[PDB]
Amino acid sequence: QEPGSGIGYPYDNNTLPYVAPGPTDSRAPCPALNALANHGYIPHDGRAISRETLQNAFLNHMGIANSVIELALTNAFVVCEYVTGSDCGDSLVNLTLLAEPHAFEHDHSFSRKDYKQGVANSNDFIDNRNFDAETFQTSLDVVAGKTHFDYADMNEIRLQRESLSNELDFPGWFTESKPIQNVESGFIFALVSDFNLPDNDENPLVRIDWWKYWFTNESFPYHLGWHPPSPAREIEFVTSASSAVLAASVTSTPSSLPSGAIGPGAEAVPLSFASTMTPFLLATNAPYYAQDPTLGPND
Numbered sequence: 001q002e003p004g005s006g007i008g009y010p011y012d013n014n015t016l017p018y019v020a021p022g023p024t025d026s027r028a029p030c031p032a033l034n035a036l037a038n039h040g041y042i043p044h045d046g047r048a049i050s051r052e053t054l055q056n057a058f059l060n061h062m063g064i065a066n067s068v069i070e071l072a073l074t075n076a077f078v079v080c081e082y083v084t085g086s087d088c089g090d091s092l093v094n095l096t097l098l099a100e101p102h103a104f105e106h107d108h109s110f111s112r113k114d115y116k117q118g119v120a121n122s123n124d125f126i127d128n129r130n131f132d133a134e135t136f137q138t139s140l141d142v143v144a145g146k147t148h149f150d151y152a153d154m155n156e157i158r159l160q161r162e163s164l165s166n167e168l169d170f171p172g173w174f175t176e177s178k179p180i181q182n183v184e185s186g187f188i189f190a191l192v193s194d195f196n197l198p199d200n201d202e203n204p205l206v207r208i209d210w211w212k213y214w215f216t217n218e219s220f221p222y223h224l225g226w227h228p229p230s231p232a233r234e235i236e237f238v239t240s241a242s243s244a245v246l247a248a249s250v251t252s253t254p255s256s257l258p259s260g261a262i263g264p265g266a267e268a269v270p271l272s273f274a275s276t277m278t279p280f281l282l283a284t285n286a287p288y289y290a291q292d293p294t295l296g297p298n299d
């Protein structure tokens with residue numbers, strides 16, 4: 001928000017306003033990076049981004065500690081090298097390349113379509129990067145009529161998304177990605193679980209309105225009473241939430257689940273790509289921004 005507004009105080013004492021991305025700006029498949037870039041905590045154009053820039057932005061403006069993004073930074077830079085064909089050093093070329101499919105970006109996202117979702121021909125591809133309201137609604141629908149949800153509910157959401165994706169993607173495309181998605185599950189609990197409940201750290205419940213605001217608007221739900229977690233969330237919370245989601249008992253099993261969908265997931269590890277492998281073409285669509293309604297500087 002505008003620095004003088006005090007909307008982040010006393011959790012964030014140095015806020016910057018929301019500014020919608022322009023048609024030439026680079027945005028990511030990540031609602032967190034997009035919110036940061038929309039506020040200029042990382043470059044508004046989404047280009048040439050250092051590790052320390054990302055670390056400071058997450059820590060000071062989202063209450064996410066360095067430990068949480070250590071692997072994410074490693075993978076971002078592996079993907080940058082893979083896509084561009086050369087070492088990216090400590091300057092991530094842009095956010096858009098992070099939507100390289102079957103890499104860091106993965107199938108069965110909560111709020112994005114798959115790279116080959118619903119395509120009539122094997123060579124087609126679509127926008128697997130920008131926020132997709134319909135896709136997100138498929139996640140929200142699992143928890144319809146609720147204000148909060150728990151680990152078991154999250155497990156049902158990711159299962160619904162795996163089911164839909166496996167049914168709708170071009171035959172042969174769908175590839176399950178439990179370890180990456182469920183880090184991101186942990187991330188959701190880390191950012192938008194309800195810290196105003198007495199047992200948040202041990203039994204966190206996501207506030208659905210907070211989640212919806214963050215994903216739809218790619219800005220921070222201050223107007224709904226959200227603030228950056230304090231103290232900043234650490235990696236242990238995230239991987240614990242991740243394991244807890246996948247350990248949760250399934251009481252409604254979707255059809256067309258990939259094999260082994262139900263049960264624990266592997267620990268996330270650094271990505272690696274064979275030097276002979278040419279990257280898939282990136283979707284070229286202009287960055288998404290909220291239009292219903294459009295956001296002001298303090299939203």
Ligand code: HEM
Binds near residue numbers: 029030073098190
């Ligand atoms: C340097 C740090 C980060 C990088 C490079 C990164 C990168 C990515 C990428 C490539 C995806 C696309 C995966 C897919 O859904 O197909 C993604 C998704 C996502 N990211 Fe980030 N991320 C970072 C940090 C964070 C943090 C700290 C949070 C929250 C605390 C977060 C929240 C999410 C969520 C919830 C998704 C899933 C979106 C969906 O499934 O619709 N990210 N991230």
Ligand SMILES: *[C@@H]1O[C@H](CO)[C@@H](O[C@@H]2O[C@H](CO)[C@@H](O)[C@H](O)[C@H]2NC(C)=O)[C@H](O)[C@H]1NC(C)=O
Binds near residue numbers: 025083279281
């Ligand atoms: C983000 O960077 C990527 C990587 O350089 C860009 O994707 C490449 O764009 C060039 C044209 O500038 C093409 O020749 C390549 O084919 C693209 N690579 C792939 C794998 O598709 C991308 O255009 C950049 N996006 C933004 C918005 O800046």
Ligand SMILES: *[C@H]1O[C@H](CO)[C@@H](O)[C@H](O)[C@@H]1O[C@H]1O[C@H](CO)[C@@H](O)[C@H](O)[C@@H]1O
Binds near residue numbers: 283285
């Ligand atoms: C991105 O741009 C490519 C080259 O300009 C097109 O070949 C792709 O189909 C893709 O087009 C989509 O996104 C752009 C945004 O730049 C629109 O201009 C297109 O109409 C389309 O939505």
Ligand SMILES: *[C@@H]1O[C@H](CO)[C@@H](O)[C@H](O)[C@H]1NC(C)=O
Binds near residue numbers: 009
């Ligand atoms: C914001 O400023 C207040 C007042 O000086 C201070 O007490 C608080 O610790 C600050 N918050 C942060 C995160 O630095």
Ligand SMILES: *[C@@H]1O[C@H](CO)[C@@H](O)[C@H](O)[C@H]1NC(C)=O
Binds near residue numbers: 212214217223290
């Ligand atoms: C997006 O932000 C606007 C402005 O604060 C708000 O009115 C709207 O409800 C938000 N959208 C969601 C889905 O939370």
Ligand SMILES: *[C@H]1O[C@H](CO)[C@@H](O)[C@H](O)[C@@H]1O
Binds near residue numbers: 235239240
């Ligand atoms: C989540 O999982 C990691 C290992 O994957 C642990 O190091 C952490 O303490 C938490 O249990």
Ligand SMILES: *[C@H]1O[C@H](CO)[C@@H](O)[C@H](O)[C@@H]1O
Binds near residue numbers: 201236237240241
């Ligand atoms: C790991 O940490 C998470 C979040 O604090 C808990 O929910 C889980 O039960 C385990 O202790």
Ligand SMILES: *[C@H]1O[C@H](CO)[C@@H](O)[C@H](O)[C@@H]1O
Binds near residue numbers: 239240241244247
């Ligand atoms: C990972 O950690 C979770 C959260 O404590 C457990 O529920 C699970 O069994 C796994 O060990």
Ligand SMILES: *[C@H]1O[C@H](CO)[C@@H](O)[C@H](O)[C@@H]1O
Binds near residue numbers: 248249250251
């Ligand atoms: C885990 O436990 C649930 C109830 O919480 C059952 O419905 C399910 O069959 C599984 O055993």
Ligand SMILES: *[C@H]1O[C@H](CO)[C@@H](O)[C@H](O)[C@@H]1O
Binds near residue numbers: 152153156252
């Ligand atoms: C069984 O119970 C779980 C617990 O959260 C739900 O997620 C599911 O929809 C079913 O009712």
Ligand SMILES: *[C@H]1O[C@H](CO)[C@@H](O)[C@H](O)[C@@H]1O
Binds near residue numbers: 142156157
């Ligand atoms: C139980 O819930 C799952 C996930 O929402 C559905 O796929 C199923 O149809 C049932 O309603």
Ligand SMILES: *[C@H]1O[C@H](CO)[C@@H](O)[C@H](O)[C@@H]1O
Binds near residue numbers: 249250252253254262
């Ligand atoms: C749906 O079915 C799966 C396996 O068929 C169970 O693991 C789950 O508990 C639910 O009953």
Ligand SMILES: *[C@H]1O[C@H](CO)[C@@H](O)[C@H](O)[C@@H]1O
Binds near residue numbers: 259260
């Ligand atoms: C289907 O395939 C997977 C292999 O990843 C197994 O986990 C599962 O037991 C089933 O055979």
Ligand SMILES: *[C@H]1O[C@H](CO)[C@@H](O)[C@H](O)[C@@H]1O
Binds near residue numbers: 182238239240243246
């Ligand atoms: C989240 O983290 C847990 C613990 O490392 C994994 O088991 C899960 O697959 C996801 O990566």
Ligand SMILES: *[C@H]1O[C@H](CO)[C@@H](O)[C@H](O)[C@@H]1O
Binds near residue numbers: 271272273274275
């Ligand atoms: C990571 O691992 C892959 C295996 O595919 C190698 O190709 C790559 O060079 C890196 O060592």
Ligand SMILES: *[C@H]1O[C@H](CO)[C@@H](O)[C@H](O)[C@@H]1O
Binds near residue numbers: 277279
């Ligand atoms: C990258 O480019 C090579 C050759 O140009 C393709 O064969 C490959 O599948 C990928 O698209």
